[PDB]
Design a protein around this ligand. Sequence first.
Ligand SMILES: *[C@@H]1O[C@H](CO)[C@@H](O)[C@H](O)[C@H]1NC(C)=O
Ligand SMILES: *[C@@H]1O[C@H](CO)[C@@H](O)[C@H](O)[C@H]1NC(C)=O
Ligand SMILES: *[C@@H]1O[C@H](CO)[C@@H](O)[C@H](O)[C@H]1NC(C)=O
Ligand SMILES: *[C@@H]1O[C@H](CO)[C@@H](O)[C@H](O)[C@H]1NC(C)=O
Ligand SMILES: *[C@@H]1O[C@H](CO)[C@@H](O)[C@H](O)[C@H]1NC(C)=O
Lengths: 344, 344, 344, 344, 344
Amino acid sequence: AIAQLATEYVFSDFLLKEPTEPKFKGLRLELAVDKMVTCIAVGLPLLLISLAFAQEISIGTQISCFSPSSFSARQAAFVDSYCWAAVQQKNSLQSESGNLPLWLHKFFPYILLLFAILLYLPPLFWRFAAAPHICSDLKFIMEELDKVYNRAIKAAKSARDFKYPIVEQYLKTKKNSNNLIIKYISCRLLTLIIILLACIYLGYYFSLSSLSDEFVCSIKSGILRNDSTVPDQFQCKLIAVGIFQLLSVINLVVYVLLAPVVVYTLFVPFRQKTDVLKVYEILPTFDVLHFKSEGYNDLSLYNLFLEENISEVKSYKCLKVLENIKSSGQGIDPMLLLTNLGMI
Amino acid sequence: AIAQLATEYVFSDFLLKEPTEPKFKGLRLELAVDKMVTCIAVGLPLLLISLAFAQEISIGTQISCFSPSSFSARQAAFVDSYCWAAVQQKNSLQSESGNLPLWLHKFFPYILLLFAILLYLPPLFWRFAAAPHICSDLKFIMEELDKVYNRAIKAAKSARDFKYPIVEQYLKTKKNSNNLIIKYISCRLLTLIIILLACIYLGYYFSLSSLSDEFVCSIKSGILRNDSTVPDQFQCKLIAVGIFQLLSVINLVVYVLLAPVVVYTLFVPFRQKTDVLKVYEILPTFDVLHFKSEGYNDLSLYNLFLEENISEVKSYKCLKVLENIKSSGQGIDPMLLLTNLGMI
Amino acid sequence: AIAQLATEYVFSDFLLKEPTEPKFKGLRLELAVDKMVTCIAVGLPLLLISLAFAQEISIGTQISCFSPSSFSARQAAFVDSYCWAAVQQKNSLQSESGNLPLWLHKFFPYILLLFAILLYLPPLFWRFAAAPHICSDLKFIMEELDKVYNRAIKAAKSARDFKYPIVEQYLKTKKNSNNLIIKYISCRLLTLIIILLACIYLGYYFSLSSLSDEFVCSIKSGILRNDSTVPDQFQCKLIAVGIFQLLSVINLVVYVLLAPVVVYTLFVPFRQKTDVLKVYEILPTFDVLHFKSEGYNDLSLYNLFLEENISEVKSYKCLKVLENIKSSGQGIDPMLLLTNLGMI
Amino acid sequence: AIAQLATEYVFSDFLLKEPTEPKFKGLRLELAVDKMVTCIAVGLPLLLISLAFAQEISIGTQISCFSPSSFSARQAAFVDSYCWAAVQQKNSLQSESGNLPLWLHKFFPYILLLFAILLYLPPLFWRFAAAPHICSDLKFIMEELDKVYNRAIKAAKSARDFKYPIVEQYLKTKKNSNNLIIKYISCRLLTLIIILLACIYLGYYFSLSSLSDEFVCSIKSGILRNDSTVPDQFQCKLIAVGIFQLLSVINLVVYVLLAPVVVYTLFVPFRQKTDVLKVYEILPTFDVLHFKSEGYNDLSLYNLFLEENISEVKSYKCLKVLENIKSSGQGIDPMLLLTNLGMI
Amino acid sequence: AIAQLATEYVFSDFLLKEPTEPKFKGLRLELAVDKMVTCIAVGLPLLLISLAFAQEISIGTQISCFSPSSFSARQAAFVDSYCWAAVQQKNSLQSESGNLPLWLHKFFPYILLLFAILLYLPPLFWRFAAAPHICSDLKFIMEELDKVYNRAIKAAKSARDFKYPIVEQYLKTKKNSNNLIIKYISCRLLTLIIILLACIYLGYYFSLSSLSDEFVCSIKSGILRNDSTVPDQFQCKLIAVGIFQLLSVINLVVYVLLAPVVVYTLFVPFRQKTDVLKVYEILPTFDVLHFKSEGYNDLSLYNLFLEENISEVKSYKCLKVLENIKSSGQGIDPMLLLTNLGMI
Ligand SMILES: *[C@@H]1O[C@H](CO)[C@@H](O)[C@H](O)[C@H]1NC(C)=O
Ligand SMILES: *[C@@H]1O[C@H](CO)[C@@H](O)[C@H](O)[C@H]1NC(C)=O
Ligand SMILES: *[C@@H]1O[C@H](CO)[C@@H](O)[C@H](O)[C@H]1NC(C)=O
Ligand SMILES: *[C@@H]1O[C@H](CO)[C@@H](O)[C@H](O)[C@H]1NC(C)=O
Ligand SMILES: *[C@@H]1O[C@H](CO)[C@@H](O)[C@H](O)[C@H]1NC(C)=O
């Protein structure tokens, strides 16, 4: 049913499942824009395939050949099945557009599934090769930030009654290596390349004459060759090709809307904005240094992932509360922090 | 079965699922009127699609063409499938109303599913882009309110035997920025625009002549062109078009009933009523200031979400009990609060 | 449906299920490259089998025989079923390519399933015969590493206020025996051999004339032998053989892309890189000795499995944080370790 | 679908389910070679049955009879069903090979299911009659070994700062009785006998003429006896008999590969190797005596089950670590044990 | 599918489900031989019913009637359905064997299901009427035995540093009443009676002429009586009657193998063996008296249930360890018990 496919592929959490494992607990490991690009680019061809053969849009078989009236029902079934299998054998069928449109019309679901798989591959490579590396580091950074917050408020609480910037040094180190960022821009670049190839294929397929689904087929190989009761050629038509073209144009539109999103995603430093650690600079136990910007290096990627997963950090939440209050400038940062009383 | 679709789409918790995650625990993050508008505007086209092809309302195929009596059963099947695929090819079919009604009749389920998806998109954008931002802030506000209540009753209990309005300052800050409110009114405005476009389309479709489902179809392209045994044209009829129109008028009625609800939702300040924090003004540890009204700013949105999710706050419940008792004015607020004894 | 098979075999965690048992908790026991090689080499033939008979690619029966017009529908069904069963009996059918292509065309799904099973067998033998042996040892090594880290920081903490390298001696012992490594390279070698045999078979099958699916069949054994109403021979065609060849070439391409991966996996010492225990050499309670390289011995296999599962080790994570910071060389290892304060 | 059966019967944990009960927690109670022999010998005939009627290998009905052209479709259906039911009634059908091949061709799935059930029976008898007896004893032995290890390290720890070999005496007692071992070799012997009978049957069935699936059938009992419009005899063919023979040869090959495994399993003392308790002899609280070898007695069976389930024993793991280190002979057993510090 | 039924009815835990309730936790309440007799006698007729209509053994309809060639397909369908419904109306059909074989052939699945239900009834009556009574008593006896063991080892431990035989008196009381034992032998006797009636019916049914499935049927009641186009009588055959007889002989064989098992089960005192409480006689806190044998009284039934469920009792396990060691006679019972140190 149409509504079942709708639920399964947009309303269900299709490709939105969090990693079912206690290693990454609440950690996203895939940027929201990347998760939605993957969800679209993968589920749309699948949702389109499932639509193209919805039981109410499909009239029946995928091909019909119009055997003569003298032919029996089984003889007609042979002609249909033969021509269906004969869209490959170029000698049997004669089509005005060519044999390539026939191949594309028969194997359109396979090609869409191929595009879905190829578009799922880069997110899978990211989830397996580079997601744990960033997950461990991000979990460690969040733990260290919570610890420095607790120590800062404990020092402030003792005042109301070591000191090494380890996380800052770790991020300074991340500023050097660029392995994770080249992995990220490589998976994004393969996603963009596959999306553009899919756009090219879908634009070509939609550009077909729309009469290329009608091909002349001749069951005259083998012992049927010199047979006389069988006519020389049959007029076959590939049903559901109009549906294929109408769905291919939808896929092409969505993909050419998605390609600018991927291209923008490709520029990872430009997206690093609203410096997340700047809110921590108001802590005594934390050095006054953001030092996170301007590079095609893993530091920018970590900045993005921190900007995403930082809302889970309670210390960040309270510090951002104080920072927003500081916009008015009524009281003072350490006083409001001591008032806070939120170690964990 | 009809009853299965009924269960799935009204009696089941379709699109009423709470976010399956411990980040938002009992927090709604979608106003009840917005949740019901989404549920209706999305499930109604899906429920209608599933109805339009219920096994007891569908007689069989979606098209029937009445081939001549001389035609074999397979030859008749070819005519049916050809004309079904030929509602697209404008050269083959001749219809009094035009080819556009034929397109709309064949692809009515697809268009309804498209409307369902487009109507689901703004709630999805709200759930992903702006729901966590409001969720963290609302959870922090509820925690701070419980904390101030506990501190107030502890001070009162010590009397029977810091002091910074942090949440008030946070809300004062929210009064300034308007990012969340423009996100909210933007998703609501896209919902209204898509609902109005769906109303326009459904009113047009229902306005079709009701004989536009009968079209004359000619299987005479290719080698069949100069064939003589095949008649010049066939009288095809698109079954289940009357069902499509009867369901389109239902969808249009429900949508023109839903559009005023969305328009009213669009006026977020007007809906901010029954000042929820006013009940907290009777606490000594809480400054005597509501300061939440009159603006197209995120403060009004936060007021709505607080009015919704505030029933989960135990301190709010007890304070509202005292406030309602105060209507009689028998005793006194601090005495009844000390009697209360409900820290958590 | 195509999309259902897509989900089940690429988007679902097919053959990615962690061992459902508390004996191995978070331990991989299968290298990521080996897990992906198994997933591909097993799920691809299964995904291809399921595709080759997707309800929208299949026109109907797998064989059609074109009985004469005088034959009844049941008589035609007998001819079809007889020839289907007669691709085996070499006396009945006469084919230009031979009877072997006919056998291969009828039993192509069985042969692909056979290849899937044979390719699943070596990973199963590894999971049952050699996975627990390495699992117990790896869990013990991780526990001992966490213990030595805790003891080192406790000694450092006492300074701020036994001693036997047991794990080093255990690994030195592993350096001697080679049972696990010969088991590993044997399962990998059988995987490579079966992949190459599958490549050979698929390249042969795809090389078939593409007209070998058309065979002449004669229902003239038994009492039908001297019967006259039945014609001498029927022109049968095996539908879905073009689909079989198009899928066999896909399987062959993926398999010849997979074979270099298996060959590279076969060289286990070469893959032992980024010495994982080198990060532990900065501990006083740990002897300054890596001693893990250069051999076709179980030590290299354990090095690979440690490199994989070591991210679960918290002590390793903190030590790698200190080691990366040491790249700048600002402070000192024991001071930063004492600052760390992460016993568990 | 083929791939569904593949998953269910090889890739799923079919007959690999651990006993769903807290009485045996992590205890195997079935030797790995016995578990795999059972899995193969049971799932292979089931997997073969499911294959023999895969929707893409089955052309349709299991029998086709070729009624005359004058016969109606229902009259043809009567002939087919009559002959299908008439492979039993020996008077009606005349076959060159005999009626026994016809019986075997009709009831091949039943015979394979019968073999699967009979092969599942001995493992079931072992799981119910003799598995709890060995489970309680093995759990007690593991608990006693952990206890003696704890006591030995506690005595060693007190030195760094009763005494009855109960488990040794228990095993000495097991050395006497042979009830469990005769139960084990009896279930293995019945498994071997049933496997050999299945090999004999499958080798016979595969040896059929391959034209025994074509039998002449005569619907001429009752009032049809002297009827004239009905022909004297019909040429029926049992479709899917070639598939049955091709699957029977596969089953026979796998079974004659499995029979040597069962025969080797039958020699339980020979398999008792790598004396597991020898690693415990380095404990002071444990007497220096293995005393486990050379007998057709329950002690050898317990030795096998201990060798299997001993990896779950933590004390055994640590002791084996020390024993492997002792191969180099650098330090000393009690010193390394005291260093160990792994009571539980 | 055959393999699905195989899994469901032998390989699944069909009728082996433990009582899903915390009242009986690990308590069997059904003797293993009784559980297996129930499983066989109930699942075998169900497994046989499911086999008799496996989609690959069923050719199609259950009856075929061979209407004349002039009859239309719908007219043939009327004859088939009429005769199917007319095996009851004795006036319409004329069969050589009689109308009773026809009744038995049509309703064979119903009769097998009836036998399955009647054979399930006595185990159900036992599970509901007499299982809780024995469950409470057995749980109390096990608790009292664990308590007396704990007290005995505590007295022995105090020596190394009340007294009423309550459970012995309870069992002495059980020796008097015979309600549970007459309930048990009554359910077993009804099981045996129903098994013997099923054997009689199946032996009769299998003894049918095997041509009793062919009956002459006449659709000539009502307005068809004096009609002329309809022939006087039709030759109908009940397909799948040979399958019914082949399955009935299997059921009869299994049932005549099962009946001796039930008869042996009927002799409950004879089965009371290996006196389970004899192992407790070596406790000082336990009187030296077995006092459990020789009677058609509830004590023998309790002895059987204790022999079954006693392996769950830890104290029994340790005491049996000491008793087996006592076979050698090396040490002494109280010394080894004090060494034991297993209170719970
Ligand atoms: C069919 O007849 C034609 C007559 O020209 C001949 O060339 C051809 O070889 C024949 N083919 C077969 C299959 O007999
Ligand atoms: C069919 O015959 C007509 C006769 O006017 C001719 O114009 C047309 O080209 C023919 N088409 C084919 C397919 O032969
Ligand atoms: C069929 O007739 C031919 C005539 O030559 C004869 O050789 C053959 O034995 C006959 N077969 C049967 C089944 O009667
Ligand atoms: C059929 O006719 C034959 C003629 O010989 C006769 O022997 C036989 O008894 C008849 N059977 C029936 C059913 O009338
Ligand atoms: C059918 O015709 C016969 C002629 O003898 C007559 O006896 C009988 O009553 C008729 N039945 C009906 C239904 O008219």
